[PDB]
Symmetry: C2
Subunit: 379 residues, 2 copies
Amino acid sequence: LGLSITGLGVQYPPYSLGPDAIDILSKRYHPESPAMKKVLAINRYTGIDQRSSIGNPDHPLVNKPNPPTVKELHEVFMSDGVPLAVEASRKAMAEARLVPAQITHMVSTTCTDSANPGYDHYVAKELGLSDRLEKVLLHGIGCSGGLAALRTAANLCLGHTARGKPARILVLALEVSTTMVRSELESIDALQETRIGIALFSDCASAVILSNGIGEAPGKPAIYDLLGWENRVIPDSEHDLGGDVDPMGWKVVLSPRVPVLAKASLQPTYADLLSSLQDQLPSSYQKPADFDWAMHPGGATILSGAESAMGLTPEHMRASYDRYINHGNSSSATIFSVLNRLREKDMDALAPGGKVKEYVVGCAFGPGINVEMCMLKRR
Amino acid sequence: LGLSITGLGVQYPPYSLGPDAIDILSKRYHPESPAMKKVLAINRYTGIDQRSSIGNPDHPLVNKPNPPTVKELHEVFMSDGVPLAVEASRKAMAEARLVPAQITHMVSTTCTDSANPGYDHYVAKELGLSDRLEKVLLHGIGCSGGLAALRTAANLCLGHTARGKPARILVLALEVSTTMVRSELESIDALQETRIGIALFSDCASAVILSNGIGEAPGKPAIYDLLGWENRVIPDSEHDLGGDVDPMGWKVVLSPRVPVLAKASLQPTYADLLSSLQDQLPSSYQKPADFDWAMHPGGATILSGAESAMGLTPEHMRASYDRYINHGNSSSATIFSVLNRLREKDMDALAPGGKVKEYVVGCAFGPGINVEMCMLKRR
């Protein structure tokens, strides 16, 4: 298809918070309750060592009489999130060796902000991109957004290919979830529901450049070739995963059906993916264990579930574990971060049986329930 | 290019807000104030007779002690907005003669909701579209959404053209702005500023089918052929136009420079559109007056500005005035409404010189400031 990822860039915020961060904030704003106690216990069952944040438990935004309003959250998204997105994008462009004028489209995603003009406008301006830039700011998809944006970009690349025009697409995901800690704490205390969002979520910006190969030299280096993709919605599962707009931001919806539903979709989706391009693949890339897996680590149950459904070991998703354990669930931004870390040296030495795979399956789940998969060829 | 609009459907809600409507709620919920008084005066000369609304001034959502919250807004967006989108979509598809199965992508836009799953999910579900449908829900763009979504769809179509695949794309716009009347009224009262948003905005859902022509019912009818498009951002105009997320929804942003900025952008955007294709067009279609103009009617001065800048009579924008006077400004949903109205017989009766034009310039403006144009060939 002539589709390649030529650069990847990732920027985490300055702070790394342990499991005691929410304990501190919880004690500060709420007296002990049964639901709060269960959530604080759950916080430590995740297997997340540290979580990346734009601030620490002493940040004034999370320390007002009430949770910050959705308006106040936007202000911090712009002041503290947007700089992450700019840097992430720069680094992707620098690896791709592109100057701003060469960028033809921008596909961006977030579920932790709403704004007109969108945040992608401000990033583009800071990077100094064309006033004629074609932009798409995706909404409504949460965690599936990184791979959703990547697939949307791929269709847009081919659009330009059809017209014999070069396409270079900045693909960007930015999430600031940690600012909604007070919103979640109040819901837990007020509703006495065990809401586990605060146990999982973190802040990140990640970016890739996707090229359609037109107007690049034959033999130009890429990082991954994009071979194919699948997207499906799991039936009657809207209530299981979501984010409901609220005076306080976005109230996470996260049911116990999610791991089960997500697990059941892997095999059938992977089968569809593989059978679309099996004739493009070598004999050594037939079965699930033959691949590295770039899985969105929505939670621990996702990874162990994937190893169970697909007959994989933890090391098959080594970069997913590394992201999850060291940075937590950064929603849509996590997948590109997983693809970034996967190609680094210390990951290579952890490959199953010393076997660094030429082919990579990326996988993400989001509200819908939307499932996204893609096949990559690693140069 | 082989891109054509094969169906269009518009669904306004049943109710009409007369100029009296804001006077009523104004008096019911606020004392008299200088700023309120100015807005009420401006309301009489917007040029709008009736605004289409999901409710009357007595609707319960806008008659609570407080303005409704962004959450309560979302509930009514879902119960009262989505059905409009489903009906608009059904009609586009019916005109296109497509069954739900043939729909390959959906590009949707709104600036008056935030949700995960986004509203396009519930529409596609109710329509019975495929579980493998590729969806794009645009955010950040307000009134330029219609044409921004039509352009994105065109690129996606071409993406499938590159792969020899038929593409049939549901392009959908849904706005519910009238529910934010108490938010605007409270901002007028508390801040003592002339905020004209309440005099202008109305509710609508509109949709088109864009086909890539591959595997069509051959000799294929279309309503319009999409020949070309142009998009630009006006630098340093972010603060001139917008919609800031708020616990009460989205606060309108609207400086005095908008009419001037918009009018001045027409000349260069048009010249660029035509340079990209003036080789395809007959010599009888060279100057702005040669075309029919499907203008987004942002306000009365937008339309008069376009007449002045481009040397047009109001009849050149006959369908634009027709929607603006009778239904008001439905943000992103208006442009497919203008396009649908334009091809009707009683619009043909009002063409300049009795000359119905074969080529149509679509034009819209929104937060950015983003500007969109397109060229269409009317069958």
